[PDB]
Write a protein that binds this ligand. Structure first.
Ligand SMILES: CCCCCCCC/C=C/CCCCCCCC(=O)O[C@@H](COC(=O)CCCCCCCCCCCCCCC)COP(=O)([O-])OCC[N+](C)(C)C
Ligand SMILES: CCCCCCCC/C=C/CCCCCCCC(=O)O[C@@H](COC(=O)CCCCCCCCCCCCCCC)COP(=O)([O-])OCC[N+](C)(C)C
Ligand SMILES: CCCCCCCC/C=C/CCCCCCCC(=O)O[C@@H](COC(=O)CCCCCCCCCCCCCCC)COP(=O)([O-])OCC[N+](C)(C)C
Ligand SMILES: CCCCCCCC/C=C/CCCCCCCC(=O)O[C@@H](COC(=O)CCCCCCCCCCCCCCC)COP(=O)([O-])OCC[N+](C)(C)C
Ligand SMILES: CCCCCCCC/C=C\CCCCCCCC(=O)O[C@@H](COC(=O)CCCCCCCCCCCCCCC)COP(=O)([O-])OCC[N+](C)(C)C
Ligand SMILES: CCCCCCCC/C=C\CCCCCCCC(=O)O[C@@H](COC(=O)CCCCCCCCCCCCCCC)COP(=O)([O-])OCC[N+](C)(C)C
Ligand SMILES: CCCCCCCC/C=C\CCCCCCCC(=O)O[C@@H](COC(=O)CCCCCCCCCCCCCCC)COP(=O)([O-])OCC[N+](C)(C)C
Ligand SMILES: CCCCCCCC/C=C\CCCCCCCC(=O)O[C@@H](COC(=O)CCCCCCCCCCCCCCC)COP(=O)([O-])OCC[N+](C)(C)C
Ligand SMILES: CCCCCCCC/C=C\CCCCCCCC(=O)O[C@@H](COC(=O)CCCCCCCCCCCCCCC)COP(=O)([O-])OCC[N+](C)(C)C
Ligand SMILES: CCCCCCCC/C=C\CCCCCCCC(=O)O[C@@H](COC(=O)CCCCCCCCCCCCCCC)COP(=O)([O-])OCC[N+](C)(C)C
Ligand SMILES: CCCCCCCC/C=C\CCCCCCCC(=O)O[C@@H](COC(=O)CCCCCCCCCCCCCCC)COP(=O)([O-])OCC[N+](C)(C)C
Ligand SMILES: C[C@@H]1CC[C@@]2(OC1)O[C@H]1C[C@H]3[C@@H]4CC=C5C[C@@H](OCCC(CO)CO)CC[C@]5(C)[C@H]4CC[C@]3(C)[C@H]1[C@@H]2C
Ligand SMILES: CC(C)CCC[C@@H](C)[C@H]1CC[C@H]2[C@@H]3CC=C4C[C@@H](O)CC[C@]4(C)[C@H]3CC[C@]12C
Ligand SMILES: [Ca+2]
Lengths: 1105, 92
């Protein structure tokens, strides 16, 4: 059948035909007009049946020969006499309205369908999500139009409680009264709740127009909105999204689906609202402007397992208004004052004439209702009585079940309605159980309900007592919220690749991931020995800083809004912002380095760059408050973050805006100085004091209190306890500024010598210069080996791959390797003694020297890149060479487009030679630089310097070269000028930041270096190997300075959040929009105080009476 | 305290609120004990108790002691002292 429906659902066909009233209408001949008229006790006439039991029977009479014995006339019950058959009407209707083709899903089932079957159709076939609420609207039909305000409120509130609680508004479907007002309400607040509210009208197949059109198995069946000018029949309504078209008989009989609606009001009740929540899906009843049989239906609800409550809408109509007044004028839960029956029954009488026979019979259906006032609710429209029905409806299911507030809260948690929990569940007098808000917190954290995690903390939930090991294990092992599916791909990549099917994640496995995403020497709290013991054994199972364990959780599970919540809570804000930037940055890299349908890396890198900006904006906040303590905030050991450092975490994530921030750049400036005050010293005197040692003792050093914000070495800090003479030398030579200038002078003296050796005759044996030069490069290479070993992450391959990423460190290896090839050939070669350069081993050795020296001039740009002005130009040069590449490839093609025709036209008689690869490229290249070769153009001229090249076709070449230079000089060189002019500012801005960023790695490399430059360094190397087989900088605070610093951190985070709102709130965009919203509210009130005074001036001539 | 919380962060490090409470009607009384500590404290009002919890936004506490629980009338005199000793200092 290719439809789950047809195998399962059916219709009803009235197989059996029975008489009507038995009166043939008029018109004496009775036998055939019996065929013309006789509405079966079905309700359709004999011929409208078309049934196969009744198709070849009208020939004789029909079913049931003769009178059939009046008793047996009273025997048609559809059960025996109407057949279940395959559906014939399920599809998608379409409404003809402005730009909305509004769709639905009609089914056409028999009323006998099992209630399980219905819910299945709704959920799997129609692919609907189980609701968090069901608002079953019951009212009267053809209720013309409600007053303008009362339609606005019941039109905003029903939509607001259905868009926020994902609810199914069960209805009647007929476009008259209830469904008519529900639909208009939808249309007045559509397109914000469009694909959120699912409105199922349960209509009969009786009172239904274009009934024959809806027929058609699996169709896009059409439908109209032109109300049939004559008909009492009813049309389905525009905005209802689904339809249950029950069938028992025919037209009329609008009472066979009432039982099926009740089934769906039950079967949803037995489903759990959420996988974690034990409460069933709620069901509420909304009465507005009802009927005579409403108050009957109301009675049924409040007498069931459990009592489906009722929210009545007074001020709209008759039954609501009746039911409004009666339960309002009731005893607390019971009878009335001195008999109120006179007014009540009179009140009941005017709505509906009953008249003491059954106007009393209402008083019984009207007593048990008001006796159940606790379950009944009423929205007093026009009295701000719970702020449209959304509060009232949702409230109705919390107050009227005498339920625990645990269940009342959790319902709000599944609804995501914090206001209803904070204004009706956390109200004064509420008394909670020992750990019930904890279970709410556990559900809010898993369900990613940040706004309840806020509330549960604000009330009393301590995350110190809350957060334990076995619980925080659960939080990783959930699928009941927003998840990072990569956390398993990461936990796989650390646990050797094997994940058993269960594999309940362990915190030790999370610690291994945090070590891998944070890189280097990071050691998490979970991988330590002290945790692997308490863990496998299982206050001690409670973590000391819980909100640092959940910040990581929220990040590893890719829960930014929870991460951007738990970050404000707790201490070490700037640290956690730089960790998170690092976790997301590594999570992002491993997402791009993997195969997956959703890349989830532009999401993670943005998440990383969101916390990276929080750290910078807190640094700018601390720096604007105190500069000295802000620099201390960059270098204190964290002690919950692997003894790391907020700066080290930023350098780990290449978070350049933080390292290029003026605070770090000023600390970096102060670590460069050392104990020397270069504000009352000059570079002349540092150089002078390197060459004149006793001039070290005439320059200004820095006190211990001008060196407290500066991370130091231990030995350096041990000489802040006392300045004596030998201490004053240890302060000079160990400053990074001095190690620099003490290396530059050796390096400049090195080039002066190596320039001399390369320009002067090189004899058999190396001269004293060339020995001094080899010694430098030899020991300089030992230093680079030592730099690589004593670097960072113990994996030999990592230290390698880092050091070979800098430009000049690649050049250093070529420069060092090439020099000792050249020395091997130079020194290892048999001198000829007739004349040098007859030995080609010797020549090759020298020519490597003459080329190796180019590496060593270009290395001066690394020394010159220490200046604030020069260095950004040096980095800039390379960023431009990379960006001008494709312009220069075009310039190389125009070159060959010219050199090959020229060489071919001017030298026709050439055999193949390697000189043909020079001559096609040589002169055309030197033309780019202004050499025109004027007397080689027009080789047939008299002034020509190539008179023998004159021959056939050579008159073409001056035309060719005229085009060539026009292209190269007038187009391509000036296009490249234009390139540089329009890319200058942005490469200069990048190069300033990359310069400021790499000033960390540079300055911090000159703390680790020995004191002696690369010729005499070997002493320092040897002394460091002696004390290796015989025996970086840190910020030392006393315990009171750590206190004063953690205060300063806290105080500056407060000023950050305070000043962020004070700016947002004090902005014209915010002041226009709240002004906008107040003038709305006022205007409403001004046309209501304006109404009241219009009800006062009428009361000047009435009181006059 | 609620008044402080409704107008905090503009007067945060400006208003100093000293509650002079007895060591009698005081919850988690045994927890506050501990010489020179960052001692913990809760805001989960003990479901059964007539006892009283210190309030969230008070920045200082004078926890007078004479006896035990109950007896909420031994600090009244000390508050009066601090209402006097400040009176004898010159405002500027
Ligand atoms: C970041 C840090 C990275 C570190 C990177 C470091 C990388 C270092 C890289 C090093 C690569 C070194 C390559 C050298 C090439 C030698 C070839 C040569 O000259 O052959 C000639 C000399 O042949 C001899 O045997 C000469 C022996 C005497 C001289 C000693 C050689 C010194 C080598 C230097 C040691 C360097 C110390 C390195 C210290 C570091 C052969 O020519 P011939 O004699 O004319 O003809 C022979 C044939 N016949 C027998 C038929 C006649
Ligand atoms: C240390 C030595 C420095 C010396 C300079 C050496 C050049 C320095 C190069 C810097 C950056 C530029 C990219 C790298 C270049 C290598 C190949 C390449 O990428 O090809 C590209 C295709 O290009 C072609 O297919 C045409 C190549 C023809 C070569 C002709 C050379 C002629 C002279 C000209 C040479 C004379 C020198 C010109 C200098 C201005 C593919 O590139 P892509 O996939 O689009 O990737 C671009 C970047 N991205 C990944 C971010 C998108
Ligand atoms: C990122 C940058 C990378 C580079 C990218 C670009 C590629 C660069 C590659 C270019 C091709 C070079 C091929 C050389 C051919 C062999 C030469 C030879 O054997 O001997 C010659 C070598 O001595 C010289 O004087 C010529 C060397 C060429 C210098 C280049 C100048 C033009 C710039 C080029 C730039 C523009 C390139 C435009 C695009 C193509 C000498 O003379 P001969 O006659 O050949 O032989 C001896 C005979 N004789 C004694 C009688 C004289
Ligand atoms: C603004 C000023 C211009 C005024 C306008 C009128 C134009 C005037 C042109 C007139 C054409 C006649 C000139 C040649 C004279 C006769 C033959 C002769 O002497 O040939 C000479 C070469 O020259 C040639 O062989 C032919 C040159 C033709 C190219 C002319 C340019 C076309 C217009 C513009 C093109 C631009 C693109 C067009 C699209 C915009 C032979 O002399 P040789 O070379 O020294 O070699 C002799 C020695 N050999 C025997 C050993 C080889
Ligand atoms: C730039 C300032 C900053 C600091 C720089 C770092 C400072 C350190 C820098 C470099 C290392 C030390 C340099 C001097 C070493 C050689 C001394 C010498 O004369 O050797 C040479 C001596 O022997 P000879 O000359 O072969 O003797 C021949 C004698 N005979 C002919 C009589 C047989
Ligand atoms: C590794 C770390 C190095 C650090 C430096 C420490 C080591 C440096 C120390 C000593 C090394 C020098 C040893 C000299 C031995 C004698 C040489 C000789 O015979 O005569 C030469 C003398 O010497 C010179 O003229 C100097 C040669 C080097 C030039 C650069 C010196 C400055 C660099 C380093 C110092 C500056 C500091 C830089 C800071 C800004 C040349 O003689 P002449 O008179 O020209 O010959 C006549 C020519 N005629 C034949 C055509 C007529
Ligand atoms: C494959 C070759 C061996 C491997 C070399 C691989 C490079 C290794 C690295 C370095 C090499 C070690 C230093 C130079 C060695 C000189 C040797 C020499 O012959 O000197 C001659 C003069 O020249 C000198 O005496 C030069 C002395 C200055 C050296 C500069 C460093 C001093 C700084 C201190 C700080 C630390 C310095 C050290 C840091 C490493 C004297 O020798 P000779 O015999 O009297 O005369 C020459 C020969 N003849 C007899 C034919 C005329
Ligand atoms: C790990 C890094 C790579 C290392 C590579 C390995 C390096 C070492 C390579 C090679 C070993 C040295 C060979 C020894 C010479 C044998 C021949 C001989 O005896 O002398 C002949 C030399 O004839 C020539 O052509 C010499 C050319 C030498 C230069 C080539 C190497 C360039 C290295 C590239 C740069 C790399 C820099 C580093 C880049 C990072 C002639 O001289 P003769 O014999 O005295 O007398 C005449 C006899 N005859 C006329 C009859 C012929
Ligand atoms: C025995 C020997 C006797 C003495 C020897 C004397 C040797 C003299 C040695 C050097 C000359 C330069 C002296 C000026 C220094 C100024 C101060 C300074 O530090 O400025 C900057 C230079 O920082 C550097 O690192 C400069 C490195 C220079 C070496 C490159 C040479 C270029 C050669 C290529 C040219 C070829 C032509 C070369 C000639 C053929 C750094 O300062 P900053 O980062 O801005 O910090 C201050 C910031 N503030 C202002 C905010 C506070
Ligand atoms: C004999 C002596 C001559 C003079 C000596 C001169 C010494 C040199 C002078 C100055 C050196 C400048 C310092 C560089 C600073 C670091 C830059 C760096 O790391 O790499 C930069 C790129 O790579 C380069 O820029 C490569 C180095 C460029 C040198 C230019 C050679 C061109 C010649 C060949 C043509 C000759 C034609 C003829 C052929 C025969 C950084 O680029 P980026 O943008 O950050 O990232 C790249 C990735 N991207 C592509 C996606 C963007
Ligand atoms: C620009 C728009 C179009 C206008 C073009 C105007 C056309 C130009 C007009 C006329 C055509 C060119 C010929 C005129 C000159 C002939 C004189 C002569 O003999 O010259 C030489 C030969 O030269 C030849 O034999 C060349 C023959 C044709 C070359 C191909 C067409 C060039 C036009 C390209 C157009 C590119 C268009 C590109 C399109 C963007 C010299 O010969 P010789 O040495 O005296 O002979 C004796 C030799 N012997 C002793 C060895 C035996
Ligand atoms: C896409 C681009 C198109 C242009 C181009 O790049 C690619 O195409 C390349 C092909 C090259 C030639 C290949 C073969 C040889 C033979 C050789 O014969 C040695 C003989 C003898 C010495 O005397 C041995 O002993 C001499 C050199 C020559 C002619 C090359 C010249 C350069 C050319 C034209 C290159 C040119 C730049
Ligand atoms: C084709 C070969 C055999 C001939 C020689 C090629 C020329 C172009 C080579 C010889 C040595 C080379 C230089 C060696 C060292 C450096 C330092 C480096 O930081 C940038 C490149 C630079 C500046 C090289 C540029 C190109 C260079 C000048
Ligand atoms: Ca020129």
């Amino acid at each position: 059948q290719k439809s789950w429906i047809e195998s399962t659902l059916t219709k009803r066909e009235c197989v059996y035909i029975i008489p009507s009233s038995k009166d043939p209408h008029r018109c004496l001949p009775g036998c055939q007009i019996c065929q013309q008229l006789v509405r079966c006790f079905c309700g359709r006439l004999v011929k409208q049946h078309a049934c196969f039991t009744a198709s070849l029977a009208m020939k004789y009479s029909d079913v049931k020969l003769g009178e059939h014995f009046n008793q047996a006339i009273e025997e048609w019950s559809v059960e025996k006499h109407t057949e279940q058959s395959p559906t014939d009407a399920y599809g998608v209707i379409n409404f003809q309205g402005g730009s909305h083709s509004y769709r639905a899903k009609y089914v056409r089932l028999s009323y006998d369908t099992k209630p399980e079957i219905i819910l299945q159709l709704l959920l799997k076939e129609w692919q609907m999500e189980l609701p968090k609420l069901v608002i079953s609207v019951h009212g009267g039909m053809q209720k013309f139009e409600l007053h303008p305000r009362i339609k606005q409120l019941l039109g905003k509130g029903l939509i607001k409680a259905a868009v926020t609680t994902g609810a199914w508004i069960l209805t009647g479907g007929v476009n008259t009264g209830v469904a008519k007002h529900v639909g208009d309400a939808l249309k007045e607040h559509a397109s914000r709740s469009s694909r959120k509210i699912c409105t199922i009208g349960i209509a009969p197949w009786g009172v239904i127009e274009n009934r024959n059109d809806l027929v058609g198995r699996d169709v896009v069946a059409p439908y109209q909105t032109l109300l049939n000018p004559l008909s009492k029949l009813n049309v389905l309504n525009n905005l209802h999204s689904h339809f249950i078209l029950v069938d028992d008989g025919t037209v009329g009989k609008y009472g066979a689906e009432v039982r099926l609606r009740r089934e769906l009001e039950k079967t949803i009740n037995q489903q759990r609202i959420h996988a974690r929540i034990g409460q069933g899906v709620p069901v509420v009843a909304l009465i507005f402007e009802g009927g005579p049989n409403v108050i009957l239906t109301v009675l049924e609800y409040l007498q069931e397992s459990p009592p489906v409550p009722v929210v009545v809408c007074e001020g709209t109509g008759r039954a609501a208004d009746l039911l409004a007044y009666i339960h309002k004028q009731t005893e607390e839960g019971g009878n009335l004052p001195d008999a109120a029956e006179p007014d009540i029954i009179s009140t009941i009488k005017k709505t509906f004439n009953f008249g003491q026979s059954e106007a009393v019979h209402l008083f019984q259906t009207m007593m048990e209702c008001m006796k159940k006032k606790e379950l009944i609710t009423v929205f007093h429209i026009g009295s701000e009585d719970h702020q449209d029905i959304d509060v009232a409806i949702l409230t109705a299911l919390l107050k009227g079940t005498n339920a625990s507030a645990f269940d009342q809260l959790i319902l709000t948690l599944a609804w995501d309605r914090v206001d209803i929990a904070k204004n009706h569940v956390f109200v004064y007098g509420q008394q909670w159980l020992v750990g019930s808000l904890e279970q709410a917190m556990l559900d809010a954290l898993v369900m990613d309900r940040v706004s309840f995690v806020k509330l549960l903390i604000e009330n009393g939930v301590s995350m110190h007592k809350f957060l334990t090991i076995p619980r925080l294990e659960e939080l990783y092992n959930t699928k009941q919220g927003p998840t990072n599916p990569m956390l398993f791909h990461l936990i796989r990549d650390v646990k050797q690749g094997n994940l058993p099917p269960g594999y309940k994640i362990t915190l030790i496995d999370i610690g291994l991931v945090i070590e891998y995403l944070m890189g280097g020497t990071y050691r998490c709290t979970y991988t330590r020995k002290r945790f692997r013991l308490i863990y496998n054994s299982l206050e001690t199972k409670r973590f000391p800083y819980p909100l640092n364990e959940l910040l990581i959780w929220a990040c590893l599970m890719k829960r930014q809004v929870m991460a951007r919540f738990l970050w404000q809570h707790g201490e070490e804000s700037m640290a956690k912002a730089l960790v998170a930037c690092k976790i997301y940055r590594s999570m992002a890299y491993e997402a791009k380095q993997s195969d997956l349908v959703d890349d989830t890396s532009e999401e993670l890198k943005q998440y990383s760059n969101d916390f990276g900006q929080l750290a910078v904006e807190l640094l700018e906040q601390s720096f604007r408050q105190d500069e000295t303590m802000a620099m201390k905030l960059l270098t204190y050991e964290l002690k919950n973050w692997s003894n790391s450092t907020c700066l080290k975490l930023a350098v780990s994530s290449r978070l350049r805006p933080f390292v290029a921030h003026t605070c770090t750049q000023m600390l970096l400036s102060d670590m460069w100085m050392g104990r020397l005050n270069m504000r009352k010293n000059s570079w002349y005197k540092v150089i002078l004091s390197i060459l004149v040692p006793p001039a070290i003792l005439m320059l200004e050093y820095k006190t211990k209190a001008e060196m407290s914000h500066i991370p130091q070495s231990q030995d350096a800090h041990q000489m802040t306890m006392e300045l004596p003479i030998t201490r004053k030398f240890y302060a000079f030579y160990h400053a990074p500024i001095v190690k620099f200038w003490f290396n530059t002078l050796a390096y400049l003296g090195f080039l002066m010598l190596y320039t001399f050796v390369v320009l002067v005759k090189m004899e058999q044996l190396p001269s004293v210069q060339e020995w001094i030069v080899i010694a430098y490069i030899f020991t300089y290479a030992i230093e680079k080996v030592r730099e690589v070993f004593m670097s960072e992450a113990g994996k030999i391959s990592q230290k390698i791959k880092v050091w070979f990423s800098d430009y000049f460190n690649v050049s250093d290896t070529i420069a060092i390797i090439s020099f000792f090839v050249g020395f091997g050939l130079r020194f290892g070669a048999k001198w000829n003694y007739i004349n040098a350069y007859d030995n080609h081993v010797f020549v090759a050795g020298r020519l490597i020297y003459c080329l190796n020296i180019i590496f060593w001039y270009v290395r001066l740009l690394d020394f010159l890149a220490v200046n604030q002005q020069a260095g950004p130009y040096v980095m800039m040069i390379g960023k431009m060479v990379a960006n001008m590449f494709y312009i220069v490839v075009i310039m190389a093609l125009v070159l060959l487009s010219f050199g090959v025709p020229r060489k071919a036209i001017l030298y026709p008689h050439e055999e193949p030679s390697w000189s043909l690869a020079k001559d096609i490229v040589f002169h055309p290249y030197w033309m780019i630089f202004g050499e025109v070769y004027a007397y080689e153009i027009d080789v047939c001229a008299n002034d020509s310097t190539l008179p023998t090249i004159c021959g056939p076709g050579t008159w073409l070449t001056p035309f060719l070269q005229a085009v060539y230079l026009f292209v190269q000089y007038i187009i391509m060189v000036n296009l490249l000028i234009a390139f540089f002019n329009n890319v200058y500012l942005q490469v200069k801005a990048i190069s300033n930041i990359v310069w400021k960023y790499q000033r960390y790695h540079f300055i911090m490399a000159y703390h680790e270096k020995p004191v002696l430059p690369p010729p005499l360094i070997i002493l320092s190397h040897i002394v460091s190997l002696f004390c290796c087989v015989c025996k970086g900088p840190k910020l030392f605070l006393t315990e009171e300075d750590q206190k004063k610093l953690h205060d300063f951190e806290e105080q500056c985070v407060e000023m950050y959040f305070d000043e962020k709102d004070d700016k947002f709130n004090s902005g014209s965009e915010e002041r226009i929009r709240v002004t906008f919203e107040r003038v709305e509210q006022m205007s409403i009130q001004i046309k209501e105080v304006g109404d009241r005074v219009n009800y006062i001036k009428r009361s000047l001539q009435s009181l006059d009476s």
